[PDB]
PDB file of all heavy atoms in Angstrom:
ATOM      1  N   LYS A   1       0.821  -1.194   0.017  1.00 16.07           N
ATOM      2  CA  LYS A   1      -0.005   0.010   0.007  1.00 16.07           C
ATOM      3  C   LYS A   1       0.845   1.261   0.027  1.00 16.07           C
ATOM      4  O   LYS A   1       0.536   2.260  -0.657  1.00 16.07           O
ATOM      5  CB  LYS A   1      -0.949  -0.041   1.156  1.00 16.07           C
ATOM      6  CG  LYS A   1      -1.924  -1.121   1.127  1.00 16.07           C
ATOM      7  CD  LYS A   1      -2.923  -1.093   2.300  1.00 16.07           C
ATOM      8  CE  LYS A   1      -3.955  -2.171   2.229  1.00 16.07           C
ATOM      9  NZ  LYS A   1      -3.371  -3.553   2.325  1.00 16.07           N
ATOM     10  N   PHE A   2       1.968   1.195   0.720  1.00 16.78           N
ATOM     11  CA  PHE A   2       2.871   2.383   0.729  1.00 16.78           C
ATOM     12  C   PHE A   2       3.512   2.587  -0.668  1.00 16.78           C
ATOM     13  O   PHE A   2       3.819   3.673  -1.064  1.00 16.78           O
ATOM     14  CB  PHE A   2       3.927   2.271   1.817  1.00 16.78           C
ATOM     15  CG  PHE A   2       3.451   2.585   3.201  1.00 16.78           C
ATOM     16  CD1 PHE A   2       3.026   1.598   4.031  1.00 16.78           C
ATOM     17  CD2 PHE A   2       3.413   3.948   3.569  1.00 16.78           C
ATOM     18  CE1 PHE A   2       2.578   1.973   5.281  1.00 16.78           C
ATOM     19  CE2 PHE A   2       2.981   4.284   4.864  1.00 16.78           C
ATOM     20  CZ  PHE A   2       2.542   3.307   5.726  1.00 16.78           C
ATOM     21  N   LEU A   3       3.766   1.459  -1.391  1.00 17.36           N
ATOM     22  CA  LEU A   3       4.303   1.582  -2.739  1.00 17.36           C
ATOM     23  C   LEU A   3       3.184   2.099  -3.687  1.00 17.36           C
ATOM     24  O   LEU A   3       3.499   2.825  -4.627  1.00 17.36           O
ATOM     25  CB  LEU A   3       4.825   0.225  -3.206  1.00 17.36           C
ATOM     26  CG  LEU A   3       6.101  -0.238  -2.456  1.00 17.36           C
ATOM     27  CD1 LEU A   3       6.391  -1.700  -2.817  1.00 17.36           C
ATOM     28  CD2 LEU A   3       7.280   0.640  -2.855  1.00 17.36           C
ATOM     29  N   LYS A   4       1.950   1.705  -3.476  1.00 16.87           N
ATOM     30  CA  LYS A   4       0.831   2.117  -4.342  1.00 16.87           C
ATOM     31  C   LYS A   4       0.591   3.623  -4.191  1.00 16.87           C
ATOM     32  O   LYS A   4       0.565   4.328  -5.197  1.00 16.87           O
ATOM     33  CB  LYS A   4      -0.411   1.303  -4.020  1.00 16.87           C
ATOM     34  CG  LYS A   4      -1.631   1.954  -4.609  1.00 16.87           C
ATOM     35  CD  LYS A   4      -2.890   1.308  -3.991  1.00 16.87           C
ATOM     36  CE  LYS A   4      -4.161   2.143  -4.231  1.00 16.87           C
ATOM     37  NZ  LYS A   4      -5.314   1.676  -3.488  1.00 16.87           N
ATOM     38  N   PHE A   5       0.501   4.112  -2.954  1.00 16.08           N
ATOM     39  CA  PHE A   5       0.219   5.550  -2.711  1.00 16.08           C
ATOM     40  C   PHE A   5       1.451   6.391  -2.930  1.00 16.08           C
ATOM     41  O   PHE A   5       1.352   7.584  -2.850  1.00 16.08           O
ATOM     42  CB  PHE A   5      -0.433   5.775  -1.381  1.00 16.08           C
ATOM     43  CG  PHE A   5      -1.798   5.136  -1.248  1.00 16.08           C
ATOM     44  CD1 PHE A   5      -2.108   3.945  -0.663  1.00 16.08           C
ATOM     45  CD2 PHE A   5      -2.875   5.952  -1.749  1.00 16.08           C
ATOM     46  CE1 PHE A   5      -3.322   3.444  -0.534  1.00 16.08           C
ATOM     47  CE2 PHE A   5      -4.154   5.423  -1.627  1.00 16.08           C
ATOM     48  CZ  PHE A   5      -4.373   4.214  -1.039  1.00 16.08           C
ATOM     49  N   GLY A   6       2.636   5.736  -3.045  1.00 15.96           N
ATOM     50  CA  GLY A   6       3.804   6.417  -3.564  1.00 15.96           C
ATOM     51  C   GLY A   6       4.682   7.105  -2.566  1.00 15.96           C
ATOM     52  O   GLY A   6       5.711   7.712  -2.942  1.00 15.96           O
ATOM     53  N   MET A   7       4.331   7.005  -1.240  1.00 15.16           N
ATOM     54  CA  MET A   7       5.068   7.818  -0.295  1.00 15.16           C
ATOM     55  C   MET A   7       5.541   6.911   0.876  1.00 15.16           C
ATOM     56  O   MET A   7       4.842   5.933   1.256  1.00 15.16           O
ATOM     57  CB  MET A   7       4.266   8.984   0.277  1.00 15.16           C
ATOM     58  CG  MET A   7       4.128  10.103  -0.706  1.00 15.16           C
ATOM     59  SD  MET A   7       3.141  11.461  -0.222  1.00 15.16           S
ATOM     60  CE  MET A   7       1.485  10.807  -0.472  1.00 15.16           C
ATOM     61  N   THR A   8       6.689   7.226   1.463  1.00 15.23           N
ATOM     62  CA  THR A   8       7.241   6.450   2.540  1.00 15.23           C
ATOM     63  C   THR A   8       6.520   6.716   3.844  1.00 15.23           C
ATOM     64  O   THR A   8       5.907   7.781   4.050  1.00 15.23           O
ATOM     65  CB  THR A   8       8.754   6.854   2.690  1.00 15.23           C
ATOM     66  OG1 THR A   8       8.902   8.238   2.695  1.00 15.23           O
ATOM     67  CG2 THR A   8       9.483   6.237   1.555  1.00 15.23           C
ATOM     68  N   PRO A   9       6.575   5.723   4.740  1.00 16.87           N
ATOM     69  CA  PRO A   9       5.938   5.948   6.074  1.00 16.87           C
ATOM     70  C   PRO A   9       6.709   6.932   6.916  1.00 16.87           C
ATOM     71  O   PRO A   9       7.903   7.078   6.756  1.00 16.87           O
ATOM     72  CB  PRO A   9       5.948   4.553   6.738  1.00 16.87           C
ATOM     73  CG  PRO A   9       7.021   3.835   5.950  1.00 16.87           C
ATOM     74  CD  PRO A   9       7.001   4.335   4.578  1.00 16.87           C
ATOM     75  N   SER A  10       6.026   7.572   7.841  1.00 20.23           N
ATOM     76  CA  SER A  10       6.685   8.448   8.864  1.00 20.23           C
ATOM     77  C   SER A  10       7.184   7.541   9.996  1.00 20.23           C
ATOM     78  O   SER A  10       6.452   6.627  10.398  1.00 20.23           O
ATOM     79  CB  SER A  10       5.699   9.499   9.339  1.00 20.23           C
ATOM     80  OG  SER A  10       5.577  10.543   8.426  1.00 20.23           O
ATOM     81  N   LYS A  11       8.376   7.749  10.405  1.00 20.12           N
ATOM     82  CA  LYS A  11       9.033   6.884  11.423  1.00 20.12           C
ATOM     83  C   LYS A  11       9.618   7.632  12.540  1.00 20.12           C
ATOM     84  O   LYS A  11      10.772   7.490  13.001  1.00 20.12           O
ATOM     85  CB  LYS A  11      10.149   6.090  10.747  1.00 20.12           C
ATOM     86  CG  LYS A  11       9.736   5.327   9.488  1.00 20.12           C
ATOM     87  CD  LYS A  11      10.916   4.544   8.918  1.00 20.12           C
ATOM     88  CE  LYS A  11      10.521   3.847   7.584  1.00 20.12           C
ATOM     89  NZ  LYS A  11      10.936   4.735   6.452  1.00 20.12           N
ATOM     90  N   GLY A  12       8.788   8.515  13.176  1.00 21.84           N
ATOM     91  CA  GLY A  12       9.218   9.228  14.332  1.00 21.84           C
ATOM     92  C   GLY A  12       8.137   9.794  15.245  1.00 21.84           C
ATOM     93  O   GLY A  12       7.183  10.336  14.731  1.00 21.84           O
ATOM     94  N   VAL A  13       8.233   9.533  16.537  1.00 21.67           N
ATOM     95  CA  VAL A  13       7.289   9.976  17.551  1.00 21.67           C
ATOM     96  C   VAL A  13       8.037  10.472  18.753  1.00 21.67           C
ATOM     97  O   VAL A  13       8.974   9.859  19.218  1.00 21.67           O
ATOM     98  CB  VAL A  13       6.263   8.873  17.945  1.00 21.67           C
ATOM     99  CG1 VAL A  13       5.504   9.328  19.123  1.00 21.67           C
ATOM    100  CG2 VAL A  13       5.339   8.630  16.736  1.00 21.67           C
ATOM    101  N   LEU A  14       7.597  11.623  19.257  1.00 25.13           N
ATOM    102  CA  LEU A  14       8.121  12.153  20.559  1.00 25.13           C
ATOM    103  C   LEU A  14       7.005  12.275  21.498  1.00 25.13           C
ATOM    104  O   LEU A  14       6.043  13.070  21.410  1.00 25.13           O
ATOM    105  CB  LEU A  14       8.721  13.584  20.311  1.00 25.13           C
ATOM    106  CG  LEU A  14       9.129  14.232  21.602  1.00 25.13           C
ATOM    107  CD1 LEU A  14      10.389  13.644  22.224  1.00 25.13           C
ATOM    108  CD2 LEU A  14       9.248  15.735  21.446  1.00 25.13           C
ATOM    109  N   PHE A  15       7.050  11.441  22.619  1.00 28.46           N
ATOM    110  CA  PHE A  15       6.081  11.552  23.722  1.00 28.46           C
ATOM    111  C   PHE A  15       6.580  12.625  24.699  1.00 28.46           C
ATOM    112  O   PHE A  15       7.731  12.530  25.159  1.00 28.46           O
ATOM    113  CB  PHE A  15       5.940  10.206  24.462  1.00 28.46           C
ATOM    114  CG  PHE A  15       5.423   9.062  23.631  1.00 28.46           C
ATOM    115  CD1 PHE A  15       6.017   7.864  23.690  1.00 28.46           C
ATOM    116  CD2 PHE A  15       4.346   9.225  22.865  1.00 28.46           C
ATOM    117  CE1 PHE A  15       5.579   6.823  22.924  1.00 28.46           C
ATOM    118  CE2 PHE A  15       3.830   8.183  22.081  1.00 28.46           C
ATOM    119  CZ  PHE A  15       4.464   6.978  22.106  1.00 28.46           C
ATOM    120  N   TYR A  16       5.687  13.562  24.946  1.00 27.64           N
ATOM    121  CA  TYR A  16       6.063  14.569  25.988  1.00 27.64           C
ATOM    122  C   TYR A  16       4.849  14.828  26.848  1.00 27.64           C
ATOM    123  O   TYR A  16       3.610  14.776  26.430  1.00 27.64           O
ATOM    124  CB  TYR A  16       6.463  15.916  25.344  1.00 27.64           C
ATOM    125  CG  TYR A  16       5.363  16.673  24.538  1.00 27.64           C
ATOM    126  CD1 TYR A  16       4.601  17.572  25.240  1.00 27.64           C
ATOM    127  CD2 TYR A  16       5.069  16.351  23.269  1.00 27.64           C
ATOM    128  CE1 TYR A  16       3.539  18.272  24.591  1.00 27.64           C
ATOM    129  CE2 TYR A  16       4.094  17.062  22.556  1.00 27.64           C
ATOM    130  CZ  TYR A  16       3.304  18.004  23.243  1.00 27.64           C
ATOM    131  OH  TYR A  16       2.266  18.669  22.577  1.00 27.64           O
ATOM    132  N   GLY A  17       5.104  15.047  28.120  1.00 26.63           N
ATOM    133  CA  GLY A  17       4.101  15.213  29.113  1.00 26.63           C
ATOM    134  C   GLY A  17       4.580  15.160  30.591  1.00 26.63           C
ATOM    135  O   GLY A  17       5.710  15.021  30.813  1.00 26.63           O
ATOM    136  N   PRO A  18       3.623  15.296  31.565  1.00 25.65           N
ATOM    137  CA  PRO A  18       4.028  15.248  32.929  1.00 25.65           C
ATOM    138  C   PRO A  18       4.526  13.872  33.293  1.00 25.65           C
ATOM    139  O   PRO A  18       4.144  12.871  32.730  1.00 25.65           O
ATOM    140  CB  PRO A  18       2.747  15.649  33.627  1.00 25.65           C
ATOM    141  CG  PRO A  18       1.666  15.394  32.690  1.00 25.65           C
ATOM    142  CD  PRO A  18       2.228  15.605  31.377  1.00 25.65           C
ATOM    143  N   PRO A  19       5.325  13.789  34.385  1.00 25.77           N
ATOM    144  CA  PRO A  19       5.795  12.465  34.785  1.00 25.77           C
ATOM    145  C   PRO A  19       4.680  11.565  35.259  1.00 25.77           C
ATOM    146  O   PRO A  19       3.707  12.002  35.869  1.00 25.77           O
ATOM    147  CB  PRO A  19       6.744  12.788  35.959  1.00 25.77           C
ATOM    148  CG  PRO A  19       7.094  14.202  35.669  1.00 25.77           C
ATOM    149  CD  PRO A  19       5.859  14.888  35.197  1.00 25.77           C
ATOM    150  N   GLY A  20       4.830  10.280  34.999  1.00 25.32           N
ATOM    151  CA  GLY A  20       3.885   9.251  35.434  1.00 25.32           C
ATOM    152  C   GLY A  20       2.605   9.048  34.654  1.00 25.32           C
ATOM    153  O   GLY A  20       1.669   8.583  35.203  1.00 25.32           O
ATOM    154  N   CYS A  21       2.603   9.528  33.364  1.00 27.71           N
ATOM    155  CA  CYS A  21       1.381   9.426  32.608  1.00 27.71           C
ATOM    156  C   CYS A  21       1.408   8.330  31.540  1.00 27.71           C
ATOM    157  O   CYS A  21       0.366   8.113  30.895  1.00 27.71           O
ATOM    158  CB  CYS A  21       1.086  10.748  31.928  1.00 27.71           C
ATOM    159  SG  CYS A  21       0.708  12.044  33.087  1.00 27.71           S
ATOM    160  N   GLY A  22       2.526   7.569  31.398  1.00 30.48           N
ATOM    161  CA  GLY A  22       2.576   6.430  30.572  1.00 30.48           C
ATOM    162  C   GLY A  22       3.390   6.462  29.357  1.00 30.48           C
ATOM    163  O   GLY A  22       3.174   5.631  28.433  1.00 30.48           O
ATOM    164  N   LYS A  23       4.362   7.402  29.267  1.00 30.04           N
ATOM    165  CA  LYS A  23       5.220   7.450  28.029  1.00 30.04           C
ATOM    166  C   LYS A  23       6.115   6.249  28.038  1.00 30.04           C
ATOM    167  O   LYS A  23       6.207   5.450  26.983  1.00 30.04           O
ATOM    168  CB  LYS A  23       6.049   8.703  28.041  1.00 30.04           C
ATOM    169  CG  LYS A  23       5.144   9.937  28.170  1.00 30.04           C
ATOM    170  CD  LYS A  23       6.027  11.251  28.082  1.00 30.04           C
ATOM    171  CE  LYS A  23       6.887  11.438  29.283  1.00 30.04           C
ATOM    172  NZ  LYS A  23       6.163  11.814  30.490  1.00 30.04           N
ATOM    173  N   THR A  24       6.868   5.948  29.085  1.00 31.96           N
ATOM    174  CA  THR A  24       7.675   4.722  29.137  1.00 31.96           C
ATOM    175  C   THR A  24       6.794   3.483  29.117  1.00 31.96           C
ATOM    176  O   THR A  24       7.153   2.437  28.543  1.00 31.96           O
ATOM    177  CB  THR A  24       8.525   4.760  30.381  1.00 31.96           C
ATOM    178  OG1 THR A  24       9.243   5.947  30.482  1.00 31.96           O
ATOM    179  CG2 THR A  24       9.483   3.540  30.512  1.00 31.96           C
ATOM    180  N   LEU A  25       5.606   3.585  29.685  1.00 33.53           N
ATOM    181  CA  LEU A  25       4.678   2.435  29.614  1.00 33.53           C
ATOM    182  C   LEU A  25       4.228   2.197  28.188  1.00 33.53           C
ATOM    183  O   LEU A  25       4.186   1.070  27.731  1.00 33.53           O
ATOM    184  CB  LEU A  25       3.452   2.768  30.538  1.00 33.53           C
ATOM    185  CG  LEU A  25       2.519   1.663  30.875  1.00 33.53           C
ATOM    186  CD1 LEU A  25       3.233   0.675  31.849  1.00 33.53           C
ATOM    187  CD2 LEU A  25       1.242   2.150  31.535  1.00 33.53           C
ATOM    188  N   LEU A  26       3.989   3.224  27.433  1.00 33.65           N
ATOM    189  CA  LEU A  26       3.614   3.074  26.028  1.00 33.65           C
ATOM    190  C   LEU A  26       4.761   2.411  25.251  1.00 33.65           C
ATOM    191  O   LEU A  26       4.579   1.599  24.394  1.00 33.65           O
ATOM    192  CB  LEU A  26       3.218   4.417  25.369  1.00 33.65           C
ATOM    193  CG  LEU A  26       1.801   4.904  25.621  1.00 33.65           C
ATOM    194  CD1 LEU A  26       1.639   6.357  25.633  1.00 33.65           C
ATOM    195  CD2 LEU A  26       0.856   4.311  24.628  1.00 33.65           C
ATOM    196  N   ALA A  27       6.050   2.901  25.525  1.00 34.92           N
ATOM    197  CA  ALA A  27       7.199   2.360  24.838  1.00 34.92           C
ATOM    198  C   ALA A  27       7.366   0.839  25.185  1.00 34.92           C
ATOM    199  O   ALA A  27       7.660   0.061  24.322  1.00 34.92           O
ATOM    200  CB  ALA A  27       8.480   3.098  25.200  1.00 34.92           C
ATOM    201  N   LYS A  28       7.127   0.464  26.472  1.00 37.85           N
ATOM    202  CA  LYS A  28       7.335  -0.907  26.798  1.00 37.85           C
ATOM    203  C   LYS A  28       6.179  -1.769  26.290  1.00 37.85           C
ATOM    204  O   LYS A  28       6.337  -2.996  26.060  1.00 37.85           O
ATOM    205  CB  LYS A  28       7.445  -1.019  28.361  1.00 37.85           C
ATOM    206  CG  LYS A  28       8.653  -0.400  28.917  1.00 37.85           C
ATOM    207  CD  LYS A  28       9.855  -1.014  28.296  1.00 37.85           C
ATOM    208  CE  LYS A  28      11.172  -0.334  28.725  1.00 37.85           C
ATOM    209  NZ  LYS A  28      11.340   1.059  28.146  1.00 37.85           N
ATOM    210  N   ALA A  29       5.021  -1.198  26.035  1.00 37.70           N
ATOM    211  CA  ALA A  29       3.895  -1.862  25.389  1.00 37.70           C
ATOM    212  C   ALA A  29       4.248  -2.067  23.908  1.00 37.70           C
ATOM    213  O   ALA A  29       3.917  -3.111  23.334  1.00 37.70           O
ATOM    214  CB  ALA A  29       2.586  -1.078  25.585  1.00 37.70           C
ATOM    215  N   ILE A  30       4.868  -1.057  23.323  1.00 31.49           N
ATOM    216  CA  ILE A  30       5.377  -1.244  21.934  1.00 31.49           C
ATOM    217  C   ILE A  30       6.377  -2.402  21.911  1.00 31.49           C
ATOM    218  O   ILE A  30       6.338  -3.244  20.923  1.00 31.49           O
ATOM    219  CB  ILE A  30       6.037   0.046  21.458  1.00 31.49           C
ATOM    220  CG1 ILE A  30       4.984   1.139  21.269  1.00 31.49           C
ATOM    221  CG2 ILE A  30       6.822  -0.223  20.083  1.00 31.49           C
ATOM    222  CD1 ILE A  30       4.007   0.751  20.114  1.00 31.49           C
ATOM    223  N   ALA A  31       7.177  -2.488  22.954  1.00 32.46           N
ATOM    224  CA  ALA A  31       8.213  -3.500  22.927  1.00 32.46           C
ATOM    225  C   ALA A  31       7.671  -4.911  22.738  1.00 32.46           C
ATOM    226  O   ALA A  31       8.298  -5.792  22.060  1.00 32.46           O
ATOM    227  CB  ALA A  31       9.058  -3.472  24.190  1.00 32.46           C
TER     228      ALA A  31
END
């Protein structure tokens, strides 16, 4: 599908926010 629509995927995310809201938790869920 990425070849069909002709454009590469975006490969970058920055989680920002107050401490203890789940950024590291989201990363470990990705893991």
Side-chain angles (χ1 to χ4, degrees):
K1 296 182 176 67
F2 280 98
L3 293 167
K4 165 193 164 190
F5 290 99
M7 287 178 280
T8 46
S10 287
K11 307 182 187 94
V13 170
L14 172 76
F15 297 135
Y16 69 92
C21 292
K23 309 184 287 289
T24 307
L25 196 70
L26 278 152
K28 294 302 175 289
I30 293 296

